[PDB]
Amino acid sequence: FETISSETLHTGAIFALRRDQVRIVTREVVEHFGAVAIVAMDDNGNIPMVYQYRHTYGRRLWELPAGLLDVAGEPPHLTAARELREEVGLQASTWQVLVDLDTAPGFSDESVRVYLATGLREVGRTMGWYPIAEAARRVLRGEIVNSIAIAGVLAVHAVTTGFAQPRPLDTEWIDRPTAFAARRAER
Amino acid sequence: FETISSETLHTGAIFALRRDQVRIVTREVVEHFGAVAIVAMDDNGNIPMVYQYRHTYGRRLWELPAGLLDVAGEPPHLTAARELREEVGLQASTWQVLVDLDTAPGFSDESVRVYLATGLREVGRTMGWYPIAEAARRVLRGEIVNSIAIAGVLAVHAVTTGFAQPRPLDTEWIDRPTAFAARRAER
Numbered sequence: 261f262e263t264i265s266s267e268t269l270h271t272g273a274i275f276a277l278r279r280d281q282v283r284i285v286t287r288e289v290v291e292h293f294g295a296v297a298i299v300a301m302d303d304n305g306n307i308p309m310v311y312q313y314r315h316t317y318g319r320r321l322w323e324l325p326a327g328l329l330d331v332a333g334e335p336p337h338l339t340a341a342r343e344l345r346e347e348v349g350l351q352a353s354t355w356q357v358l359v360d361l362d363t364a365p366g367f368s369d370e371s372v373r374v375y376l377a378t379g380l381r382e383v384g385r386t387m388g389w390y391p392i393a394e395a396a397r398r399v400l401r402g403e404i405v406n407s408i409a410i411a412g413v414l415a416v417h418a419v420t421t422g423f424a425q426p427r428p429l430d431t432e433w434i435d436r437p438t439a440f441a442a443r444r445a446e447r
Numbered sequence: 448f449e450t451i452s453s454e455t456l457h458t459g460a461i462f463a464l465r466r467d468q469v470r471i472v473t474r475e476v477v478e479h480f481g482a483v484a485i486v487a488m489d490d491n492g493n494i495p496m497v498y499q500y501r502h503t504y505g506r507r508l509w510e511l512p513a514g515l516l517d518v519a520g521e522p523p524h525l526t527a528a529r530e531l532r533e534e535v536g537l538q539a540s541t542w543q544v545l546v547d548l549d550t551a552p553g554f555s556d557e558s559v560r561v562y563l564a565t566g567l568r569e570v571g572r573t574m575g576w577y578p579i580a581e582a583a584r585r586v587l588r589g590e591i592v593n594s595i596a597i598a599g600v601l602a603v604h605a606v607t608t609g610f611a612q613p614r615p616l617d618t619e620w621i622d623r624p625t626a627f628a629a630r631r632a633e634r
Contacts, residue, residue: 261500261502269457269464270456270457270464272466272473272475273473273475274475274553274554275475275554277456277457277464279459280502282502286459286460287502288459288460288461288462289502289503290477290554290555292551292554295553313448314549314552314553315448315467315469315474315476316476316549316551316552316553316554316555316556317549317552317556317558317621317622319621321549321552323552328553359586359587359589359597360589360592361592361593361594361597362501362503362504362508362592362593362594363550363551363594364479364503364550364551364555364557364594365501365503365504365508365510365593365594365595366461366482366501366503366515367461367462367477367479367503367555368477368503368551368554368555369503369504370551371504371592393610396605396610396611397610397611399546399602399605400546400602400605400606400610400611400612401611402546402547402614402618402619402621405547405548405549405558405621405622406548406549406552407548407549407550407551407552407594407595407597407598408552408594410546410548410594410597410598410601410602411594411597411598411601414597414598414601414602414604414605415586415587415597415601417601417605418583418586418587418601418604419587421608423580423583423584423587424583424584424587424588425587427589431589432589434504434506434589434592435504435592
């Protein structure tokens with residue numbers, strides 16, 4: 261394919277709208293920072309999940325601890341650990357790549373990297389702990405709909421059943437976003 | 448929460464950008480038609496998947512047959528069957544709700560309903576057939592990243608392993624989008 265022209269329609273706080281002419285059709289793309297989420301499994305096979313309000317839906321959704329890659333230069337790995345700390349008060353000795361997901365391939369360039377964190381310590385000084393199998397049944401029951409949470413929960417479920425394995429932190433993130441970050445629209 | 452004001456920033460072909468002031472912070476939402484995807488499992492436990500180019504990522508991705516709910520009044524169920532036909536030349540005797548997913552809860556109201564279609568007939572006159580277990584391993588291997596495809600594949604995988612069950616077509620779709628459709632910006 262060929263990108264004829266690129267035009268910015270609007271730049272917001274967390275994303276930008278750009279219209280491209282493609283080889284000829286209009287292709288409006290929502291540039292995004294990209295994000296990271298964490299599936300922190302304890303030694304008993306349970307994971308922590310948060311209950312957060314999502315304006316887009318006008319209600320609260322059960323999700324994995326997660327955050328945007330809105331810190332220029334900060335490694336996703338670091339961002340993920342920082343978020344696990346802030347969100348559920350946990351630090352993990354081990355970090356591996358569970359699954360990457362492209363949220364809305366149809367209109368945005370956001371990609372989310374989900375990590376599997378184990379060897380947990382409770383640090384610091386709404387959320388719930390769910391056994392992985394129950395979290396999985398919740399997904400298949402519609403109680404968990406957030407796309408990042410679905411991927412993470414079913415992915416770790418496939419891992420805890422012996423079906424698959426996690427991955428090295430250095431696993432390539434094929435679609436990690438870069439456009440919105442490259443704009444540096446701030447200051 | 449309280450929605451103070453709603454302002455439309457831009458209306459496109461498949462989505463609209465609206466900025467809301469929430470109880471006070473800015474909350475830009477991408478209104479979407481919503482979409483449907485189909486996991487058509489044959490009697491041997493294999494499903495068809497398409498290899499489609501996604502401008503947002505600048506490459507082709509493996510996905511499930513899917514389409515937008517851009518047909519006013521048309522039942523998702525109908526849209527899904529139409530898409531299964533057009534995309535992979537299949538008609539299914541049985542239709543059940545596999546899983547619903549909210550793609551990007553952070554900035555868009557799109558929600559996607561994934562159906563499990565069985566009792567297949569090849570009708571009519573790129574895509575591939577993958578055994579469910581292999582499709583599942585592809586996900587956990589990063590070969591399948593589309594969020595809708597991930598949900599569908601791992602969901603049917605949990606079903607084919609006896610872990611969970613599908614659902615009636617009348618299952619409630621909690622976050623089926625309505626805002627963009629309600630605008631009726633056309634003609």
